[PDB]
Ligand binder design. Sequence first.
Ligand code: ATP
Ligand code: MG
Length: 541
Amino acid sequence: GKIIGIDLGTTNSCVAIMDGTTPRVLENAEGDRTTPSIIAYTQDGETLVGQPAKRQAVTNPQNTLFAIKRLIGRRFQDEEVQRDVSIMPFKIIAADNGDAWVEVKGQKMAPPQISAEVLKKMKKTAEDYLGEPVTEAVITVPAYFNDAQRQATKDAGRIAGLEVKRIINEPTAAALAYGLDKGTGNRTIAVYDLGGGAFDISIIEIDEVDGEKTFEVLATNGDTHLGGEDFDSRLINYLVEEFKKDQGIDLRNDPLAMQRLKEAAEKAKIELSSAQQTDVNLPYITADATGPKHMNIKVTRAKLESLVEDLVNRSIEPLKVALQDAGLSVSDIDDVILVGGQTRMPMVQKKVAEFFGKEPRKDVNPDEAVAIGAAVQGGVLTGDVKDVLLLDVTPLSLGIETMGGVMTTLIAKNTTIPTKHSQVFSTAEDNQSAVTIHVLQGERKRAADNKSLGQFNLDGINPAPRGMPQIEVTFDIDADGILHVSAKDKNSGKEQKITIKASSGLNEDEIQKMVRDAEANAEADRKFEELVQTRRLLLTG
Ligand SMILES: Nc1ncnc2c1ncn2[C@@H]1O[C@H](COP(=O)(O)OP(=O)(O)OP(=O)(O)O)[C@@H](O)[C@H]1O
Ligand SMILES: [Mg+2]
């Protein structure tokens, strides 16, 4: 029946549901509206999830899994995974197929199996509230997730016993949450998302026309090196160096001490969003030949700000890029929305307010907006939420080059995504053994006047006269906006394919110029195409 919305976070997860017109964030059994994305396998053979796992992490470093979102859908040889292997206290391994897996108590486990434990806890939280079984869910992912990362997140949902009705990206979710407020129509917003695992900025248009409120992503980009875990690392390094200065001991080779220090550092960071100073007090942190040793280090907000200032400042250039990619000025941004617990740092809030020249909206909850928006999307699917449309359409026509230097369109401009279209082409010359698939974007009929998106060859064509071979070309744009182009020789069975990433933005100013350019050249483009036609469309070598 009902469709729950789940924010599956690097650090914390959250589940919400539509209660008629208003979404409700649901509390787990401890009373908490968020649940740590932490999974622990205990000595006695049971699996802990959430705060119970978090509480015993410091004593069970090998078998307490966290930050698995950094691994989900990734290959073991991925740079981020290799970077992750050294710092993580649990064992990260290569699966037989090369994926990044984990090993706990001799058991090899794929990331989706681990994240499924967190999603199952979100599901029971909802089932407890509703008093009925729950199986339909909208699950969110970062806007920077690729196909493999999205697919692995869907698999995690299914392993949790959920029907994954939709995946949507976290900034769009936040925008749906904000867009519930009154007076939010026909505005451009900036979603500044500083979570545990990454920084992400999205520019989203919320328009209201003929009673329908539409949500469209105009630009997005992210940086996984600017997340709250990186803030923690700066403070941890400071505490390590300070303890060496104070007592001549380097804690880095002591895993138990480093786990306690990581937890204390994060708590000190959080406290310094409220206070001007805090005390990191860790008794019996280690010992040497002269007995036990104890840590007591005062950290001021000014010191923390000095340690992470570069991280905060590195979030500004991604903002400038997103605005360039949307073709907008800061003066076009009508509201700024902060998402993510790391945006509660006063320094972050001031830097964002300074850049946009306006205070971020304070009626958006940075810890819950993503889950709320996922629940809104669920309400759209059931009909509980009316007059709301997530708008994702192609900005420009997409096609391939055919004989005579012509652009042949496979997907027309303004086609709703996801979409799939195929057309059969043939060879231009007798006994042609290969064709070149040149993928093009734009509105002109001359292939050379459009943008080239990539190209690949299909060879192995059996000898035959021109026009006889049947080459099926398929364009498929998936829900992640990624364009998949394939060419298949129907008589030989051979196929080749490429993947084309989504554009980082949609610049309507420039798109409309291109459209007007094409309209201004419409008759000239027709005459060009017509006498090329005087020679099933054909492909050259
Ligand atoms: N009051 C605070 N001040 C500063 N940092 C905070 C505060 N509260 C939480 N954090 C930090 O925010 C981060 C967690 O934020 P959040 O729960 O939004 O992440 P997430 O959604 O799980 O991550 P992602 O979006 O990367 O999947 C952690 O680094 C945590 O230490
Ligand atoms: Mg998040």
